[PDB]
């Protein structure tokens, strides 16, 4: 038999969350912590101070005129009014808040032998090993960032009628699947929190059979939820999902986009992470939703669906040359350099990689998330 002298290799896995993150420069000789101030407006409820005098000259508990309350009676009760011979009547107070983040360390290494280096039939083995090492490092770092983002969400909307992760179940009267009304509510919440948009509406083209789409935000889903999204129907019973070929004209298709529903442009991320066993126990009445085995009991699987806003978070950069993350690689080939003091044979070697990673969440209200089950 005759070896082909060529190898079969699988490329990297493309990364979606890492490119979004912005980088904040942190000089050394300071520590492992970064902090910022945040000045709250005058009228928000967060303005808890002790500098209040009402219109009658008497001290009052709250220093903000009226909170984030739209009630007309409350506003009329707490309006600032001034008489003609006015003096020392209305006082206001201010407040600032601080936030922080920290840097953590990572790393891994591998070993090999000189006889394996030489006598091996394949030539260029160590190049392959370096390639897989680097790919593994990149994939791990992306997974860590995605995990931290999912853990640090600020706006959470459970689907169906659930309240916590243990309650999200796909069996019974009301299964916990994503619905059109849930997406409408998520849009409403983001609009109320003043989150800026990302894209713009797509008007029509002149070519036959081309629908008009007005989504304005970007949403990341897993691979498992795509059939569920495709099967969704809107309020009037028609189809909801609009595929990309309809509006590819008169618009720009983003990377890894599957379609548009309501006001979100769905994006499929291959390396999306899901919880395992978070849901309630699954009996034999399963309609066909994915489950998992935890402690011998079949529990449902709770799935993500995430809408990262703008300026929500930044990535601390420690000696990264203004990048999100930079790796450090070392190699020592066998020889006298690796001739151990108790073993001058020197038949082995190694290669190691390490980095520093940390994240600062400036505003956690902009991050949004939906938890659902995913069909099998």
């Amino acid at each position: 038999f005759f070896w082909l002298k060529k190898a079969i290799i699988t490329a990297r896995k493309e990364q979606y969350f890492m490119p979004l993150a912005s980088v904040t420069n942190m000089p050394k000789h300071y520590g492992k912590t970064i902090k910022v101030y945040e000045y709250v407006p005058l009228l928000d409820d967060r303005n808890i101070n002790d500098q209040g005098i009402d219109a009658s000259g008497a001290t009052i508990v709250n220093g903000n005129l009226y909170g984030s309350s739209k009630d007309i009676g409350n506003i009329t009760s707490k309006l600032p009014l001034l008489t003609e011979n006015g003096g020392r009547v209305n006082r206001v107070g201010f407040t600032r808040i601080a936030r922080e983040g920290s840097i953590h360390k990572f790393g891994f290494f591998y070993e090999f032998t000189q006889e394996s280096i030489d006598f091996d039939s394949d030539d260029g083995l160590m190049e392959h090993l370096s390639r897989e090492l680097m790919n593994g490092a990149t994939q791990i770092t992306e997974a860590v960032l995605q995990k931290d983002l999912l853990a640090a969400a600020g706006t959470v909307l459970y689907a169906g009628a659930a309240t916590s992760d243990a309650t999200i179940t796909g069996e019974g009267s009301t299964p916990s699947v994503v619905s059109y009304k849930n997406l409408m509510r998520l849009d409403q919440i983001l609009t109320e929190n003043r989150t800026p948009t990302q894209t713009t509406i797509i008007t029509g083209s002149r070519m036959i059979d081309t629908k008009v789409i007005g989504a304005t935000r970007v949403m990341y889903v897993g691979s498992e939820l795509v059939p569920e999204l495709k099967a969704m129907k809107d309020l009037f019973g028609n189809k909801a999902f609009i595929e990309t070929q309809h509006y590819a004209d008169a618009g720009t298709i983003m990377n890894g986009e599957v379609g548009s529903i309501d006001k979100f442009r769905i994006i499929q991320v291959p390396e999306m992470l899901h919880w395992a066993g978070a849901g309630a126990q699954a009996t034999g009445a399963n309609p066909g939703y994915r489950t998992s085995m935890v402690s011998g009991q079949e529990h449902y699987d709770v799935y993500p669906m995430l809408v990262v806003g703008d300026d929500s978070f930044t990535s601390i950069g420690f000696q990264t040359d203004g990048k999100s993350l930079k790796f450090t690689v070392m190699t020592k080939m066998p020889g006298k350099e690796t001739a151990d003091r108790n073993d001058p044979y020197g038949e082995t070697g190694f290669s190691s990689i390490k980095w520093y990673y940390g994240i600062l969440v400036k505003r956690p209200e902009r991050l949004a998330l939906i938890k659902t089950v995913a069909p099998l």
Partner: protein
């Protein structure tokens, strides 16, 4: 691989045994050593380089 053959590293290195030698003469280095100065000299003969 060619550089390792020239400088005697990697696969070209002799095996190590406690009771025996590890001497390898350098044929490739020798043959290259005369060729370098054979080829170099014509470019340095005259004061001017380009005609």
């Amino acid at each position: 691989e060619w550089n390792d053959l020239m400088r005697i590293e990697g696969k070209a290195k002799p095996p190590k045994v406690k009771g025996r030698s590890q001497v390898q003469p350098k044929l490739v280095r020798r043959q290259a050593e005369w060729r370098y100065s054979a080829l170099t000299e014509p470019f340095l003969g005259s004061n001017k380089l380009f005609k």
